[PDB]
Write a protein that binds this ligand. Structure first.
Ligand SMILES: [Hg+2]
Ligand SMILES: [Zn+2]
Ligand SMILES: [Zn+2]
Ligand SMILES: [Zn+2]
Ligand SMILES: [Zn+2]
Lengths: 137, 137
């Protein structure tokens, strides 16, 4: 049950990151929204962020209210022809994102212990094909 | 962001299974509880099932109320020295589980298209080490 092994490994890794991030009080998915904002250079729309964070739109709206309440995000227009609200991080958020990335790097280091760089690369190519098979549905 | 590629691939595969199962009206995780019951030979406790399905206990209790309401599961004692409630499938559930497994096999077939048996095996060994690294925390 290949799909089950993938889901279990993914759940275990996100549990471990949620544990290492637990001091930050960023409950529900909220730290994972921040992490994804930190990682893309474009400012996403709500629709784009929900896609990548992996959550329904109405769920993201609640997550975003939380982060916005804490002064970590704003919903803003970003171009003369991008008038919809885009989600942008604030300067306040930067000491926070720096810490979240450092902790996410720590979990990545530790969970990859003992795994060969070539085998990691091969594992990634298998996952990318599974994803293309799904996305090309 | 290896962890992100794993989570995205896992989310895409579970989305696809949820799509193929959508006619069965087994909303929230409920079909995934059934699938896990179908796949283990022992009857799990609530604690065991929550672990493997990947959900908090109180969340599983609601999922289970749903399935129990539909006559798909019972919570029962299973031994003279296993007096706690164990979750058992009903005979009613069998035409249902048969269909869910057939559909889960279809998704597995299709998402593995183009991926070599050796590379699948290698991918699984990488995931198993990541999981052991996490479980040996
Ligand atoms: Hg892999
Ligand atoms: Zn913490
Ligand atoms: Zn992202
Ligand atoms: Zn359906
Ligand atoms: Zn199971």
């Amino acid at each position: 049950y290949f799909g089950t092994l993938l889901a279990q490994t993914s759940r275990a890794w996100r549990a471990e990151l949620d544990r290492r991030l637990s001091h930050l009080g960023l409950s529900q998915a909220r730290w994972l929204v921040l992490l994804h904002l930190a990682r893309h250079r474009d400012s996403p729309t709500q629709r784009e962020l929900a896609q990548s964070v992996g959550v329904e739109g109405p769920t993201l709206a609640r997550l975003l209210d939380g982060l916005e309440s804490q002064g970590l995000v704003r919903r803003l227009a970003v171009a003369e022809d991008r008038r919809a609200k885009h989600i942008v991080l604030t300067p306040k958020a930067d000491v926070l994102i720096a810490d979240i990335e450092a902790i996410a790097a720590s979990v990545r280091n530790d969970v990859l212990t003992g795994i060969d760089e070539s085998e990691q690369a091969l594992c990634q190519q298998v996952l990318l094909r599974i994803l293309a098979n799904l996305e090309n549905r």
